[PDB]
């Protein structure tokens, strides 16, 4: 199409105008004080929010160049969610930071390049300044005080998600099955989580969540490329004359079938969503079987001579609840025995003894791992289903957090972390001069978000800003109750996860942005 | 229609405006420092790049006559790729300054003809010093280390590709089957690599790259003009039945069929891709021959009486992987067995026997040197699927430079080399003024590149290319280190050819640009 | 009246725009290749000129807030020539360039003011480092080579100015008495030197010089501030019948008559022109007494009772001819005679000797200095009387810029001390931040008017100031023959007085107009 084409301090300034506008309404939503947002729903009232998450979702603009800003800090802030499940707010207030401050400097004529790589050096010794900051999260009396905080000040979704790890291990699977009464009950169940996730967004029946979630599903497992609807025809209306819906774990699935389930999922005519098998190569059949170990079901392969047109009922694989995230896939609670499976592990011990690589032994502890570890029943009991619904999404968060933190270790939260290796970093210094003046747009940056959310109590930033670097250690400010003091003790606590990865990835906007030169889009 | 039409400088500086959008844009990819551009894709959130091949693509302007400019010079450099592997970008910015200083000389009243005449000869008086400064890439150590330079400075790429053109030979085909794990394995399989590309470019599956690949696809060998589906139905549909793709290889396939499997494309309906055979005349029949014994089916010809009707899956050629680039189409693994193959290269040694012009045995030995020498597969190992897909981009990178590198010699990179050739012919003049005026805004020009990368540095432009033009020999501005000294020993090269083939094709579009005097468009 | 007022950045960029305006249009007459300017005379044929001074004059802007800029700009660049005989253009320039690359850092959020203290203090030093790169300019040698260099290499200008100052001493004043033949004379002749310029521009009969000259005319003494007509009346009326002009040398002249006698230079009437007395207090009536000694006539003091109503011409002094600059006024050949004259400075020998501080005598040994010294009859002898004014303009010149070159020595010219002085300066720091960008900025611009000279030439302006920078002493270029090298033997040079005068005004725009937060003017 005819394009429109701007350079230079044109696009740089259409770019910031995006980012400001994005970056002004996700940074209202930040704060314990963290101020409402009104999305307007066509269908009828608007809905009020405070979580920068669903007002990012919400924000496109009209002119071109403006939307492509937005858009870019959106979809990094978003990554920011998907490594993190958390930050995407202090991402892209971090992003309006050092983009703003780089764009300024970039204006007065020094070398964007240099500022890129001022920018990448800051943040890169930050990084290791919060991993020497990080306080590890080790055990189930951390676990559990994660697990409370996370989840607004609860003991009981701690002490669940503290037993959960308990039992599968730091390292283990856990999602959520629901719950069936007044107790909060808690069982592994034979599952398999691997890191595939859906084809298209248009797959997704819970969009509060951002997940596909199937409740008694079949799973068909193909090892081909996909591409042709004539194959899929007795295991899709076999699936229809059945009714549970359907999922689909193939080696691909492009083009024709896939859009064409888009279709089915559009008029909503058969319930079938799709995701890729995991790993690629013969590492990926043989998981391919091990997937068929676990839901009864075959792998369906050229190698054996079947097709789909010769697949059955029998042959399709069937599980209780599958969840699919952008990237990652878990099945919970599929049909196979503990013979089949529990030989099948017998049998991949039997392929750890007859190895030759480390690694390839590796691979294999890996997936005695995903087969031996187990997905979770939390079965979270309420006195009604809205306690349930709500504890269930909050039992969601400090899952997330708790997971993160036990990752990667737990800092002090509310943006004490932040200006805190700020404060850590004030000799840093590049090679030449526009190096040196990245590292301080990078550390104003890490000022920026405690300044905001400061700001968002009334109360006055650089005043609070400055006695927070004033103070050493975890000493920072409790917004919600106004008071100065160490985080920890006070309860604010953020993964290092998500601090550092929020920092990572409003350094990449902000390098891949300040060293834009040219914008392409097509005309209004 | 209605036409609108333009002539002299009206049209030059149109043209000039036109250029001048794609240069900027794709010159400001140009860099080992090369900055970034915004591409808006509509679906969601913009692509970052810093490639001119993906930019130069995204360029089409509103204006008429500024979007010919544009295509024009879009059109030759993706020659420049298409006879080069790299130097789109390269080309562009030569396109922009021969046309630029160009278009402001025929504007001080100069003949074009004589400026046309001295870009020419200054032009190819540069190829001539470009051939006299090129340093041969002869042996498994320089074929090795323009593989690891070329591939962004991994020792492995390059012994994959030293050892795959140890195999094959210099002259022979190498293209990649790619990876099952984690080791890079290489062999021989017999395939068949000939200069005809796809028909049209709806049937492109893989954008990326510029090509269509089909995996395990059934070949169909026509001896006829293909214009009437009615025919071809038994085919295309004994194909829907089949399920694997279908490659067409006739003698042409033109309008009816042609455009049809174009919408079958399109809706993706049956993945069908069509080639035209090899040659012209009795040597295109014994060339369909030859793809008719490897491939295991039978030539259908008119000699034999047979139709495609008549065809069954017996009568259809098949293969595992075939690639099919703008202008070359590679068949990789046919079904055909040694014995048939085997006894047709002693056929083809029997009619090097019996032949008597010394040109028709040059034809008969390529055309054993094609029967027998066999493509690649380079199993990209890789721990992950990501390192695969991206350290298979980079080996099919070292892949084509290492291919032009020993096709016609290396020189240094970087600019260095036209700015060399540049120094070289300060004492070059033509017959009248003109010619000399024209001579010299070609080898400002070749200045322009080097001017541009130390631009993109932040660097003084002018400064580092009078001081390379101060050195002799290799000695050049490594960009990326911001240090001088000899380019072949600090590490940066570029082939001869696409140096040479970019300077070459940015002289076509120079004097068919200058030199015109009408443009001839529809209105707006 | 009513205001328009602006604040900020608004204010910035509209002082920016005219300081771009005065400084391009000056900055294009700046060189030994230096371009013309067309200046309009509403007369009939317009000017052509390569002088900033005469270009300077005429620059005055439409709107009111760029007006202000040029205005700046322009008055202290005149206070450039007014201390120093040439380099307003060179402070132009240098103030551009500040000016410039300051508001550039101010618009990056930096803090004015220790950019101020950065400029001001590389300024500082660079003095210091031209003071000590200096040559001194002592002997009748060095006193006839920069008399040669700077009246256009003609020798015999040399050695005039070295006779006369061989004669009077370096100390002493030389100004001109014109040609009355071929032969070039020179003699003392009688006269005193003091520091008052004229009260008012209206006065200027010869503008092209700025000054006021009045040959054979009167001087009337008045120890007392003049603003009432009615006592000068038999003054200015017995003027009017001797038919000489009358220079007045009063206390003060305020209001009435002051702009009385401008009504009277306005319609021409009676030639009369007023300053002021040299010094304040009683040594100011000991110096209209020795102005009184020289010129015939008599001081009219209150003490005495007389009044300007018994003046008679008697009373009045008498002169040759007197010379009246923006600050100074030198009386030439008064009537009075030795006895008289020498008698007096035998008193003021007297006074020596009964003075008891040393300060008083070193006011006393001044004065017998004006008093003893003398002033220069130079007939610039010509063949025609072109000649005679045009050679006369060049010993104005080379009097100018062998004067100051006597007062504080001699450098290497062309805009290469500037650029030396900033090359030796690379290591100078501030105390923060913003003082080093103000430090960086100022040594940029001390680079800039070399980068102008050259741009002038049409050579790269960069490559040229980088070769520049790369010598060591006086290495430069020479720019009117297009080669390097010592600027001293190859006779190009500026005295120190016009580089150090005008990088400090420039530096005092620099400082007091990025240090600009508010503009007031009136409405367009």
């Known amino acids: 199409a005819a394009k429109d084409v701007k350079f230079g301090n044109d696009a740089g300034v259409k770019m910031l105008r995006g980012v400001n506008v994005l970056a002004d309404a996700v940074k209202v939503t930040l704060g314990p004080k963290g101020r409402n947002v009104v999305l307007d729903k066509s269908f009828g009232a608007p809905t009020i929010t405070k979580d920068g998450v669903s007002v990012a979702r919400e924000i496109e ?16 802030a978003s990554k920011a969610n998907d490594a993190a499940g958390d930050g995407t707010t202090t991402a892209t207030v971090l992003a309006q930071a050092i983009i703003t401050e780089g764009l300024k400097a970039v204006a007065a004529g020094m070398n964007p390049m240099d ?6 050096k800051a943040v890169t010794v930050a990084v290791e300044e919060l991993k020497a900051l990080s306080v590890p999260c080790s ?73 596909v979630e199937l409740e008694s599903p079949f799973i068909l497992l193909a090892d081909k490329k996909i591409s042709n609807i004539r194959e899929m025809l007795p295991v899709l209306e076999a699936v229809a004359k059945a009714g549970k819906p359907l999922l689909i774990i193939a080696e691909d699935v492009e083009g024709e079938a896939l859009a064409t389930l888009v279709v089915n999922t559009m008029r909503g005519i058969v319930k079938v969503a799709a995701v890729k098998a995991p790993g690629f190569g013969d590492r990926r059949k043989a998981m391919l079987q091990d997937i068929a170990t676990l839901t009864g079901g075959t792998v369906i392969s050229e190698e054996i001579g079947m097709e789909l047109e010769k697949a059955t009922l029998e042959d399709l694989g069937q599980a209780k609840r599958v969840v699919i995230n952008k990237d990652t896939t878990t099945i919970i609670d599929g049909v196979g025995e503990e013979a089949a499976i529990q030989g099948r592990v017998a049998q991949i011990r039997q392929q750890i003894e007859e190895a030759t690589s480390d690694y390839d032994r590796e691979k294999l502890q ?41 990752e990667e270790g737990v800092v002090a939260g509310g943006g004490v972390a932040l200006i805190r290796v700020a404060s850590k970093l004030a000799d840093l210094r590049g090679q030449n001069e526009d190096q040196n003046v990245g590292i301080k747009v990078a550390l104003r ?33 409790n917004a919600a109750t106004e008071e100065y003091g160490n985080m920890i003790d006070m309860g604010i606590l953020d993964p290092t996860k998500v601090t550092r990865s929020a920092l990572q990835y409003a350094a990449s906007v902000a390098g891949l942005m300040i060293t834009t030169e040219c914008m392409v889009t097509d005309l209004p």
Chains 1, 2, 3 share one sequence.
């Open 366 to 406: 890996e997936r005695v791992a995903k087969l031996a570890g187990g997905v979770a029943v939390i079965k979270v009991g309420a006195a009604t289903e809205v306690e349930m619904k709500e504890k269930k999404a909050r039992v969601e968060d400090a899952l997330h957090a708790t997971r993160a933190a036990v």
């Open 139 to 211: 055990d189930s009396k951390a676990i559990a005080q994660v697990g409370t905080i996370s989840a607004n000040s609860d003991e009981t979704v701690g002490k669940l998600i503290a037993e959960a790890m308990d039992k599968v291990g730091k390292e283990g699977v856990i999602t959520v099955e629901d719950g069936t009464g007044l107790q909060d009950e808690l069982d592994v169940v034979e599952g398999m989580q691997f890191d595939r996730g859906y084809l298209s967004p248009y797959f997704i029946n819970k969009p509060e969540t951002g997940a």
């Open 61 to 76: 603009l009209e002119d071109k160049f403006e939307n492509m800003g937005a858009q870019m800090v959106k979809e990094v």
């Open 115 to 120: 500022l890129k790589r001022g920018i990448d």
């Open 445 to 477: 940056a890490m000022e920026a978000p405690l300044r905001q959310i400061v700001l968002n109590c009334g109360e006055e930033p650089s005043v609070v800003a400055n006695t927070v670097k004033g103070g050493d250690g975890n000493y920072g400010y």
